[PDB]
Every structure is written in C-alpha cells, then in structure tokens.
Coordinates of C-alpha atoms and ligand atoms in Angstrom, one line a residue:
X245 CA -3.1 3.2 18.7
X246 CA -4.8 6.4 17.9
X247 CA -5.9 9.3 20.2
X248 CA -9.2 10.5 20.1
X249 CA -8.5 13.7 18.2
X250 CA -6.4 11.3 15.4
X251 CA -9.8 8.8 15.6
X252 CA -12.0 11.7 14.6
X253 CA -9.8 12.9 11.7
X254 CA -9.5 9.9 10.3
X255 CA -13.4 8.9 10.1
X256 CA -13.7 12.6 8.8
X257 CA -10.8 12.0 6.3
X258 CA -12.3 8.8 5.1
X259 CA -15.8 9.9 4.1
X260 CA -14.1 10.9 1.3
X261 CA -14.4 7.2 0.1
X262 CA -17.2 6.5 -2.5
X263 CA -18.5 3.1 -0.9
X264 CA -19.5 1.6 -4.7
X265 CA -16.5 3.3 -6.5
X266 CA -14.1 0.9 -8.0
X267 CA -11.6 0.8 -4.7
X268 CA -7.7 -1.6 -5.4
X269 CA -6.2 -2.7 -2.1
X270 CA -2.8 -4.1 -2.2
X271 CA -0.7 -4.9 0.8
X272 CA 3.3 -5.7 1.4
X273 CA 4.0 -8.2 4.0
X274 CA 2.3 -10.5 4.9
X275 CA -1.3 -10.4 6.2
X276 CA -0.6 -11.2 9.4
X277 CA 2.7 -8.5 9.5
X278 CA 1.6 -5.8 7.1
X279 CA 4.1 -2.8 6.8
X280 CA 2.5 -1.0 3.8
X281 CA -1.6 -0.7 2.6
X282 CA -2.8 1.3 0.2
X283 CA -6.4 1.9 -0.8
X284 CA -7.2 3.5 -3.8
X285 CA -10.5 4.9 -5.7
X286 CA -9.3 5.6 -9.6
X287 CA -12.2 7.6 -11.2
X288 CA -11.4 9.9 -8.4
X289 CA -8.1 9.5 -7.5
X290 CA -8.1 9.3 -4.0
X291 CA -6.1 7.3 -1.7
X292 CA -5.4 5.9 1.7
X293 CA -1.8 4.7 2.1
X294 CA 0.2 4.1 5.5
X295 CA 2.8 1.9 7.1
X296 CA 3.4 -0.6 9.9
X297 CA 6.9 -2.0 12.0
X298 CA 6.7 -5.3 11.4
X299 CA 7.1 -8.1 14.7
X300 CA 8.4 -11.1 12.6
X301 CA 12.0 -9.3 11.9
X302 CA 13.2 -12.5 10.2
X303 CA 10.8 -12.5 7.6
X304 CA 10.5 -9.0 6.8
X305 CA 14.3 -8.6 6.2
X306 CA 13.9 -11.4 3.6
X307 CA 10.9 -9.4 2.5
X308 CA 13.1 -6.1 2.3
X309 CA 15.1 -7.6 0.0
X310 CA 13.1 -9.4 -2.2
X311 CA 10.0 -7.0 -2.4
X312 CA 9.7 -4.0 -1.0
X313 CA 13.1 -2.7 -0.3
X314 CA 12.1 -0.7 2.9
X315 CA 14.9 -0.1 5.6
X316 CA 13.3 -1.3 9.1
X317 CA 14.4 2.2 10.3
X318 CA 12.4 4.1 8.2
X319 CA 9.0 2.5 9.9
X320 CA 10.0 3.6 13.4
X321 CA 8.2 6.8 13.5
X322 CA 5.1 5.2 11.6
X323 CA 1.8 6.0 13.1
X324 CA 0.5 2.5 15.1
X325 CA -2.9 1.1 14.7
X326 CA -3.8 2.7 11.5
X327 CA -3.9 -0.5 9.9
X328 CA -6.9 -1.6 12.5
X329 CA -8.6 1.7 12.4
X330 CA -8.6 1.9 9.1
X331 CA -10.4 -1.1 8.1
X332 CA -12.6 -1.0 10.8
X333 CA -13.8 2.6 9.2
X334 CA -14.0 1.5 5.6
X335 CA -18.1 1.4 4.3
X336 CA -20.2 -1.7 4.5
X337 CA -20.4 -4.0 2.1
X338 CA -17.3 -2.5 0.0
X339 CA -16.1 -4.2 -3.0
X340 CA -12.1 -4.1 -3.8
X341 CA -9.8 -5.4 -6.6
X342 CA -6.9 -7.1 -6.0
X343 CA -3.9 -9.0 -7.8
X344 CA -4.0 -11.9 -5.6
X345 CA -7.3 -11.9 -3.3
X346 CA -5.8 -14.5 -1.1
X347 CA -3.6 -12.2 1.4
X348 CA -6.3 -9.5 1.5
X349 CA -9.0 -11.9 2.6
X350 CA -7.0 -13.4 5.5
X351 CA -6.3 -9.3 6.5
X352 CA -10.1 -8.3 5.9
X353 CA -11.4 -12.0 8.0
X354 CA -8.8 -11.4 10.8
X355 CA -10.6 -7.5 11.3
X356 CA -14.4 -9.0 11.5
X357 CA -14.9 -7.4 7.7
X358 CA -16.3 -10.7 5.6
X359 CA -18.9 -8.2 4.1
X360 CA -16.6 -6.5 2.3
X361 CA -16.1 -8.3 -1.0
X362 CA -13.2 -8.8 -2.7
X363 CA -12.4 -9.4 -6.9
X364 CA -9.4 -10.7 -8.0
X365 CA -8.2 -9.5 -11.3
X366 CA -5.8 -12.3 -11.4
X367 CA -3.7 -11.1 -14.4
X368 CA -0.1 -12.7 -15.2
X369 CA 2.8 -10.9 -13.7
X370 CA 4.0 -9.4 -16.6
X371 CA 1.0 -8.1 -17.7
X372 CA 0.0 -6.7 -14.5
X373 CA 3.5 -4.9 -14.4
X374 CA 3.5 -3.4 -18.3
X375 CA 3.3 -0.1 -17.1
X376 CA 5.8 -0.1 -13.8
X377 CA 8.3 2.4 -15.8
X378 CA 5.6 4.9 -16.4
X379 CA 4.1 4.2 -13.3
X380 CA 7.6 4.7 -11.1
X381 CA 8.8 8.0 -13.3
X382 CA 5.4 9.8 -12.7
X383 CA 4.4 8.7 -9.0
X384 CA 7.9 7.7 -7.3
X385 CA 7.7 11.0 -5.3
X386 CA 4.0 9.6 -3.7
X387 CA 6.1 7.3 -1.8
X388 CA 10.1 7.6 -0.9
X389 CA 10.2 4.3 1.4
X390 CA 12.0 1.8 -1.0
X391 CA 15.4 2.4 -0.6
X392 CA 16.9 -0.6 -0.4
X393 CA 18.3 -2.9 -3.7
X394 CA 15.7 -5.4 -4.5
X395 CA 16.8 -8.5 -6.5
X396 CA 14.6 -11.7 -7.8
X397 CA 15.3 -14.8 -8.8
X398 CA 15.0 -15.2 -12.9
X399 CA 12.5 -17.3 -15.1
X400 CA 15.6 -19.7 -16.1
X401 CA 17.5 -19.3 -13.1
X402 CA 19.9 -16.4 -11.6
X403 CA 18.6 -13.2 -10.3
X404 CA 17.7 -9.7 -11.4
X405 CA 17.6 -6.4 -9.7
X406 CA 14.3 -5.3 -9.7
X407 CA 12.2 -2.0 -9.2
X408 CA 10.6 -2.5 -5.5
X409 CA 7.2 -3.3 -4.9
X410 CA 5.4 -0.3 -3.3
X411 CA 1.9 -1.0 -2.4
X412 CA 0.4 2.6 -3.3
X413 CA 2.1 2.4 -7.2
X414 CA 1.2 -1.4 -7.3
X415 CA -2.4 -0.3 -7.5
X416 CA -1.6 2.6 -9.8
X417 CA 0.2 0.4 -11.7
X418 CA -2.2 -2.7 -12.2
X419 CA -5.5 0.3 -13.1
X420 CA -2.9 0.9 -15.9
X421 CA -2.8 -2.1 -16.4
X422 CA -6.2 -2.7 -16.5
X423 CA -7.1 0.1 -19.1
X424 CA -4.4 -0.5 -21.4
X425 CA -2.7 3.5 -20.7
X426 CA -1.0 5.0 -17.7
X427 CA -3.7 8.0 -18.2
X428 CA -5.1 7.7 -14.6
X429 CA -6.8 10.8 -13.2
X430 CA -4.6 12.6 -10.4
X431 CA -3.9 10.2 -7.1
X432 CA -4.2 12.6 -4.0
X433 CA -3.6 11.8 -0.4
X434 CA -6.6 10.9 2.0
X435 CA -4.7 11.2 4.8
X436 CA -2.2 14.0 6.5
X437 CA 1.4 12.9 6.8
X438 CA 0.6 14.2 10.0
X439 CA -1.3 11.3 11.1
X440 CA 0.5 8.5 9.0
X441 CA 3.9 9.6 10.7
X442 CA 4.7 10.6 14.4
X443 CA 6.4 13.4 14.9
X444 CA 10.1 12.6 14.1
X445 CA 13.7 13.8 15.3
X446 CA 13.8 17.5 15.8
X447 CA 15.2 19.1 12.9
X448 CA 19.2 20.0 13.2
X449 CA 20.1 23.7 13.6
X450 CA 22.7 24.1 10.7
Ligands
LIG781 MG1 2.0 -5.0 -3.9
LIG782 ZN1 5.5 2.4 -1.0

C-alpha cells in the first residue's frame, strides 16, 4: 500500500472534494477486481481517477476485450492500495451517481462505507452514451490506457468494434448525458501522476 508521506498527500489532495457536490463514480472490473475508478465532481470539475492489476487474470482478459481494452502490462507500475485508501478518505455520508448502482454498492459495503449513498441514474445504453464521440475527441488525452481493440456483440447478432470503456470519460460522458450538451466545465486531476503511478523503467539514453 501507501507510505506515510503518499497517505498524507492523498487526504491533503482529497479535501478538495465538496462532500454534497454532485460526485459520478464508475468502476471497470468488477467490484471485487477493480482495475480503473474514477470519482468525479462536475460543477467543479475535479477528479480522482487511478488503476488496479487485477488477481482474476481470466476474467479480466475477457474484460480487456470486451470493455476496457487495457493491456495487463500497462497496470504493472500502478500505484497499490489506492483503491482502499481512497474510499476509506472519501467524506461521510457522500452521495454519488452511477449507471448501474449495483457494482458500486458491493465495492462501497465490502470497504465498511454503507453511509455513503448511492443514486442510480439508470438511463438506457444508448442514451447514456449519446455523447461518447464528443466525449473521446475532447478528453481522450485524460486517459491513454485503452489500447487494445474492443468488440461487442450486436443487437441482432454479430459483433462491432467499439470505443473502450474508460471509467474517468464514462462519467464525463453520462453528465453529458444527463444535461443534454457536452459543455461540462474543465475536468482537472485530484491526484499527482506521481502517486497514481510508481516510478517506471528508467528512461533510455538515445
Ligand atoms: Mg464505466
Ligand atoms: Zn480510462
């Protein structure tokens, strides 16, 4: 997990939250084998968004490519624990939006946090997704961890290739969703990459 020094950042970092302020979670992977979370406040933009290696390699391969698209390899530097620390650090009695509530509930239960309260904004899967395009052409560059081919199955049978499902533009994309435009106020990072990512291969000397 985290260090002392990375503990005290991160509480520091996230009392940048508004504790009332409309707050959309959405998860990839499972919630017993997250990989990516995102929390994120509209009206002021901020976010928290970080990843986790999965432990049930079977099922996030199927995951890889049939949501998200992330290469297992890309998640071995990730920062570990942030998922636990995190939650345990978000305000009392929070309230969060969510497409689908059932996933974030198991998450929030299994970390001791039934105060916070979740509403599910249940909207159909294509109207939830009207503004992906938009979304993907503005924000892409918020999160580079899809690189894989993602395909899904049809309505009537066969499958597609379809843009990935990243968990930070899945919550920009369903406030669009929500208020009819893509005109969302700037998203900024809560967190350092610094404490998101380890430290990484040392750069080559070219
Ligand atoms: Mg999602
Ligand atoms: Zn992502």
């Amino acid at each position: 997990g985290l260090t002392y020094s990375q503990t005290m950042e991160l509480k520091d970092s996230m009392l940048q939250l508004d504790p009332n302020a409309k707050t959309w979670i959405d998860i990839e992977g499972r919630p017993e084998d997250p990989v990516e979370i995102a929390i994120y406040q509209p009206n002021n933009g901020q976010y928290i968004h970080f990843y986790r290696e999965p432990t049930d390699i079977k099922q996030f391969k199927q995951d890889s490519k049939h949501s998200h698209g992330i290469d297992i390899q890309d998640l071995f530097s990730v920062q570990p624990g942030l998922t636990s620390a995190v939650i345990e650090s978000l305000p009392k009695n929070m309230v969060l939006s969510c497409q689908g509530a059932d996933d974030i509930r198991k998450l929030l239960d299994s970390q001791n946090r039934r105060d916070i309260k979740l509403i599910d904004v249940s909207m159909q899967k294509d109207d939830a997704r009207k503004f992906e395009d938009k979304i993907w052409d503005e924000y892409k560059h918020l999160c580079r961890m899809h690189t894989g081919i993602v395909t899904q199955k049809k309505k009537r049978g066969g499958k597609e290739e379809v843009t990935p499902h990243c968990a930070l533009l899945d919550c920009l994309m369903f406030e669009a969703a929500v208020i009819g435009s893509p005109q969302i106020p700037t998203p900024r990072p809560v967190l350092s990459r610094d404490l998101v990512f380890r430290t990484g291969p040392p750069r080559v000397v070219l």
